[PDB]
Amino acid sequence: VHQVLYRALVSTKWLAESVRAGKVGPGLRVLDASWYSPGTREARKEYLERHVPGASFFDIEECRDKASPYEVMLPSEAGFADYVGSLGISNDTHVVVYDGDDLGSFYAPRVWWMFRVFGHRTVSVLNGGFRNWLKEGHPVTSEPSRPEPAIFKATLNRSLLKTYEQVLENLESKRFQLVDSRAQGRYLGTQPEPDAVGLDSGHIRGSVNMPFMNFLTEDGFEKSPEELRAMFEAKKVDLTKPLIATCRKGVTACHIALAAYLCGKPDVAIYDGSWFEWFHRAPPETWVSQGKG
User: Active-site residue 247, yes or no?
Assistant: First the structure.
């Protein structure tokens, strides 16, 4: 955040040099923010076995509001602060975050946004992610990162977050553009929602769809600012106006926030409850589906 936009992307070369030169410690912390659907890869375990040297695992299963019925919702300020402090991250630390997902980035934008929605601007995603760190032959360890605990002060930057109530008031004001980053079929209600029973697919009326995978090249890299800009413009998303991103559970919505951030817009808000919460709370009239339910 801050219009002195802190660099949101860091390359594999850059991070390999900093690892190699002994720079990760209290000034630079690196997080594996991997998570995968129940049944596929075991994120946590996969980290214990291979990670960039000095990287800690950031567990999204843990650093979330566990009491909520909805999926991966923000913790409290204090809950985030405690978690992140134990990983040796202070308010002065530059946090770099990657995940090991196959198109280079899935969950790392969510953690980049979590740090920012708690007022920490000095965070960046590893461009190419762990997939390209591996492909380039940079070092990995199984040895445990045991950082000193640090004090982190979290302050919820509420302009970067939307609640159910605000997205529902926006249906009568259109003061914010609403973009959904799910795959087109899920957005249209013709393909089902994964890892749920009884949850229909569809989208909030007035949402525009920008499938998050299209911000990445097949190699796993973020597309250039030049291409990202053109994508918003083809969808007629005006980057000088308020924009709210949403998806299924507020995770890939952060890719729209990252994409816009590389285009110079630092304040895309994420509707954290997203489709899962919306479907369970919203008046059924507020959403459409081509299955029609």
Answer: yes
- Nearest alpha-carbon partner for 148 in 26, 28, 260, 49: 26
Q: Which of the residues 63, 247, 254, 263 is marked catalytic?
A: 247
Which residues are annotated binding-site positions?
A: 186, 249
User: Mind listing the domains of the chain with CATH numbers?
Assistant: 1-156 (3.40.250.10), 157-292 (3.40.250.10)
Residues at the annotated binding site for substrate?
186, 249
- SS3 labels along the chain: CCCCCCCCEECHHHHHHHHHCCCCECCEEEEECCCCCCCCCCHHHHHHHCECCCEEECCCCCCCCCCCCCCCCCCCHHHHHHHHHCCCCCCCCEEEEECCCCCCCCCHHHHHHHHHHCCCCCEEEECCHHHHHHHCCCCCECCCCCCCCCCCCCCCCHHHEECHHHHHHHCCCCCCEEEECCCHHHHHCCCCCCCCCCCCCCEECCEEECCHHHHECCCCCECCHHHHHHHHHHCCCCCCCCEEEECCCCCCHHHHHHHHHHCCCCCCEEECCHHHHHHHHCCHHHEECCCCC
